[PDB]
Design a protein around this ligand. Structure first.
Ligand SMILES: [Fe+3]
Ligand SMILES: [Fe+3]
Ligand SMILES: [Fe+3]
Ligand SMILES: [Fe+3]
Ligand SMILES: [Fe+3]
Ligand SMILES: [Fe+3]
Ligand SMILES: [Fe+3]
Ligand SMILES: [Zn+2]
Ligand SMILES: [Zn+2]
Ligand SMILES: [Zn+2]
Ligand SMILES: [Zn+2]
Ligand SMILES: [Zn+2]
Ligand SMILES: [Zn+2]
Ligand SMILES: [Zn+2]
Lengths: 274, 274, 274, 274, 274, 274, 274
């Protein structure tokens, strides 16, 4: 059938990129988003897919992702432009039967390498699928401004950074009890940064890249966007607070402890111990 | 009749949540809003309400609210999404004849506990109704950013905080002469925080939760939103001022005194005395 | 998930009713439309359905329709109004496990008998499902104006009426080779008219009710609407032609024969023989 | 409060005039519509009404309409223009305490006689209120094209005209069982035509003015518009039928009888007897 | 200043052409409209006008139109397209100081003869200005469909044609008491047809061109459009009536007489006498 | 005529208030705007004005403003709401023949004192008219955020404040060479603050109220808004600069001198001398 | 043909100015944008261009730009207003056959000097065309806020400023490896600043004007806007960082080196050496 642009998932992709562009998080082509779909999501639209789609092999096969469809932003595409031309800026792809590569069924442009960052996403989808028994479906990278700024002034240490972020808005502890993972700065678009981020994604829905940005995960687009927005709201508040000379008072350790108990979550111990 | 979504009060709910999302005050599901309606408001739409609505008993009955209808945001709902699907994100409810519980007449989703925060709102509506001879109709919680930030650097003291806020924009004294109430940080969603906020609401239209957010009241959605926006505008200005090294000059006590006299309001004495 | 109104099938229902209102075919509450859905269509929206939906038993069970979901216009609803309030004017229903009745999962108003015409539709869906090996999914009734007018002047005879309609636009023969079924006038909303229409639906995708309107079937909303529009376009042309004193020339029998052969359809013999 | 233009009843007025303009029924300033409101409808908008409104006395007081508010089209206003400037083209009025006259609370322009046709409407509202125990609230005049045309060729006789209209679409008998009232042509805007129409309105929801137009009544705007549209749809079909040389077959008397019995209405006897 | 497209008079031009395109009256480039403006209308927009505008001399000077501005449709422009590109399809022009020619201040395209029909319009504006003491400001030509059709079957005689049109809707007599002027068919775009139409415009706001269309005048765009629409509504009704075999009854002479008296107009005697 | 809401000046009022609300400058009812119109602007709309308008006398007559019309925001109105209901939130007024008072011709609500701040505006319009030979037409008050913040940290001295603002963006000197006037804090809405601001307006298009906001003037809405936006852009940059520890380098006096010479303006000497 | 406003390049101009206005970068008339087009871009619209266009000679001819068309913002035009009236605020121009001057084919207003800044743009287009073998087509000036602020606190030295900007977001090095050029403050609109900027444009796509703004270049509007937005995003982050007391850690020299190698760019040596 027609109107694929108005499908729930193309509409959701437009919402999340547009929202992020409006937040100031995705200058130029900075940012990427992919969403894991089910065959039944795309089946009504078969009509629209190439009879002979482009195939791109993967360097490390991912059999966990076999026969799995996704919608994704193209590499080099601007979040700002997605609402204006969804088909030019998004692609629907499907991993083949042994996960040795993927076919581009719909969307995007005719270049060599329209989805350069997709191998890195796939690696992280795998870890998140194992970590959550198949609940996580989204991987989102953006350049969340205050979170970036904090990476120049806070210790680049999971425990220290998580603790400040929890302190900066009450609900953070409940939204990311497992804390934010962190990496040293690394060269973007490399195997190493892909593998290293995926390893952090084993124990974190949210990972910081210092002097660059954030990488997050969730079961739905709303939940992923809302995770990033919550930590970035904290960061925004902390930037103000530090800029005014630092905390005179804050949430105390035993207050953070009682928060986790009431909401039934177990907070990252290292961050609590501070 | 049909078009309930276009009714004055569903349209007002969409306006206030949308406005607050755009201000940056309601990340994720952070925020709640309820508005007290009259039977005549909803009577034309009876057509649309469940013949057998869900009933939720209250832990402490509220006979002052007997047979009273309200429109409300669901728990877990995102302010951002209200404009996109008013019926999914809002509910119309009605307190039964002895105020022992409430029925969900319209809207929201099918979960256990679609309106978790409504008991706390009701407690505060009661106090505001007594405090204003029935003029206040709205209770609004949001995460007003600069007000949050100030809770890490200013003394958490009604008099001190009120005085800075009055100084930060001229008209604040006239808009909230009774000052802002404050509480210690407390675990959200608990009886204690509900009761404690309601007790502050006896003498304040506006109450701060440190490291979390604000809770405000008013006769209309515009007036409530406009109360919060005014104090948050002050806070925004103060964040700048403190960040530049503090006040070199400001509104003086006897200037604040003359302001209250000209506009016919009596300002919180403790705040004036500073 | 939210945005059920923007789902492909609610959007399709709005398109088809709106289009028909604009054609002049559905004055007041004249007209009905139902579309057979699959479980996977509505599964993403489960969120929105009543935990305790209304049950309406059927007078004659239909086990062929067991566990089958549909979207439908309410009885008494105006096609014109569907675009303005989809949820008030449409309902999603699901036939129970032995086809003894149906539950209203979503939409419509709180009256006794919100879907009076649904038993008649179901009977015809059954015949169309058997007749097409499960391809037909839509049943649509509207008051197609020129087709109505022709029922006062043409012989109320399948063969005669089909032949004029084929002659009135070239492509009609290919679109409905099996011809239009016809009934004597009967009292609307009765078992008899329901059963009699369903019996015509055994051999026809399109059935005339003299002095009243048309009843049609198809695999998609577009195809059903387009079937009715094609026969009503023919009728419109014939009204003009008869009004100008009748045909001086027309499509000849052996031309209609060659048409069926080229397009690979076998035309109703009785209509060809004229 | 503000947004009176978006109130349910101003929105309904815009819908009904716009719909009628699109049907081709209201050239120039041809047509008028008034809707009886309740005090509670306009009470939220008091804010917007003149402190010293214009008063227009009535020639014959109507105490049945005492203290009753209405929304109305201005005299000389074009249906086409209502959607473009609701406030210029509509007025809200209120009949005083002994029904000796009315005040214009809102809308319309500053001329002498902005609502020339309102006395005639009021007379008919009175009869319809008595005739329906207060259910009818709308009086609508438009120049329904095919109904006008039929007044040059059919006998200007209630029984004869009603019978043709019933025959021209099946559901007409059920929608107006009491038939259409008719008057001789009379000079428009006169007491006589006002009184004479009101007298027909004692026993008819729908009244024909030969060579001019129709005058109808109903409990809601949708129901009134839908009554006129149904009879005008019949007329449209009959114009076609007569233009093709007349009925070869039609609905028979005993078929019309069975229709009234099944739907529980008693049809105008004189029309049945034909 | 900017936004000239949103000025009242460009907006009015878009409304009237668009409305006429939707009525079916202006296929292709069939139709023309010009509106006489005042200097104060265009003065705020001076900003937008060519410093060196194109000058087109007139064959017969019109000193009555000296220094007078107008907005106009270009020759060869499609009514349908005006809403899509007002500036391409409309022009603002101004007659020079002794009425020997006109300058194109704004709009239209760069061809030889962008306003071919403007001399003919000007001649008719002159007569209408003299005839109405300066009240008429619009000249509008369109191909009103039923009025065209009637020119093949009715006597091409002012009195006969006026009388049928008055009979075809009650209010026609009041809207055009002076009747419709008529001409023999003539070759379009010629001096003769221009002069002959202007001479009819001495005593008529509305003039028929047989087998072609209508030419009308009024003080405002609404009033002119509404004059044409009223006579074309009559014609539409008469086409139906004649098509059904002619009038069985109609408005009688003494009824038409009483109509003119009540509304204070003196009807064309020749038409009354029939 | 109708469509007054779409007139150039109501549209301009909506643009300027909406723009200012979006900038964050007009919380609640904070802000006021008035624009001086000409009789010819409102003359086409006479149709819409009260036959008996409300009269409000002035305490000090202003014969310079005799017979002068203005469009204005109501007191207590929210800038945010103007786009939603222009007529509720704006008023058109006209000063009587000896400038002893004004009549409200259109718009606003029915209270005592719908335009409380208009006397103060009028006083300043007078001074600006004398100061610019009748070129200035707008007076605008808003709570420009960074300009407010700077009033707590910079010396409240015309010369010092002007100099920083010139330094903070290159073009400021050219946009306001005469500098910004300043007052001590004063109680708002008083004669004294009205008179004192008007006296500053003798030599300044822009005046600061410490701890409150700004008051500016210009020949058009765009030019006034653009003056305030330019100084507030400077302030925004300075807030950043001061917050980072102050200027390391800046525009030098002799650079500011050369700027004024090149653009042909004479800069406030006191500010240059610093 | 018509619809020139909807052409790809007028639509692109509206997008880029509107986006920049929304970013807060173009107060009042601050900013300019020009885009080099090809003859084939404008050829379909020839229809719309003046038969006798205004000619403006250049002071220094530019034969490299001979016969070259451009679309441009007018001098004195507000970025904010472009979306509201593209034709008033943009112009299409074409350089004559020996590059001695240019003709204004379309758009803009009738003043002396509608494009004051175009000579300066042309000089820079020339250098960018030589520098990139004809790939660059855009020159854009705006007042990027955080970049302006940084010019008061950072050393005004290409190497130092480039290095901070690279450090402030990872991808900056890849987006502008050649670094940002800088000039001393100079008087705007002068030959000297025009020539000096063009000389920087020999080796830089991006040039800072201290205390004023930025001047950038690119092959497309998106790429140019995205270059400025990227450096301004860095600046925004640095303002925060410096405001919080400076970097505790950052991207290291050998990390910046490895970045350039991986992406295949050679970074400005002077900036690397720091
Ligand atoms: Fe970790
Ligand atoms: Fe207190
Ligand atoms: Fe058959
Ligand atoms: Fe009767
Ligand atoms: Fe004549
Ligand atoms: Fe001064
Ligand atoms: Fe350089
Ligand atoms: Zn990145
Ligand atoms: Zn909260
Ligand atoms: Zn039917
Ligand atoms: Zn009428
Ligand atoms: Zn013509
Ligand atoms: Zn103020
Ligand atoms: Zn500049």
């Amino acid at each position: 059938m027609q109107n694929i642009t108005q499908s729930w998932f193309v509409q959701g992709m437009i919402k999340a990129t547009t929202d992020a562009w409006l937040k100031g998080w995705d200058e130029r082509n900075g940012g990427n988003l992919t969403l894991r779909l089910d065959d039944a999501d795309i089946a009504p639209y078969h009509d629209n897919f190439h009879q002979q789609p482009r195939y791109i092999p993967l360097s490390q096969p991912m059999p966990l992702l076999a026969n799995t469809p996704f919608i994704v932003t193209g590499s080099g595409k601007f979040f700002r432009n997605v609402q204006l031309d969804p088909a030019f800026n998004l692609g629907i792809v499907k991993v083949d039967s042994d996960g040795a590569g993927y076919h581009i069924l719909w969307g995007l442009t005719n270049e060599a390498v329209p989805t350069s960052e997709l191998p890195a996403h796939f690696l992280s989808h795998c870890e998140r699928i194992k970590a959550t028994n198949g609940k996580d479906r989204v991987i989102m990278h953006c350049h969340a401004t205050n979170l970036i700024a904090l990476t120049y002034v806070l210790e680049n240490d999971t425990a220290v950074f998580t603790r400040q972020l929890w302190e900066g808005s009450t609900e953070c502890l409940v939204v990311f009890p497992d804390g934010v993972g962190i990496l040293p700065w690394m060269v973007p678009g490399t195997d190493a940064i892909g593998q290293a981020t995926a390893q952090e994604m084993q124990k974190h829905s949210l990972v910081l890249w210092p002097f660059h940005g954030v990488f997050g995960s969730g079961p739905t687009l709303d939940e992923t966007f809302g995770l990033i927005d919550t930590a970035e709201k904290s960061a925004q508040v902390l930037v103000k607070v530090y800029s005014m000379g630092g905390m005179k008072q804050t949430i105390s350790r035993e207050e953070l402890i009682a928060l986790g108990k009431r909401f039934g979550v177990t907070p990252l111990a290292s961050a609590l111990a501070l």
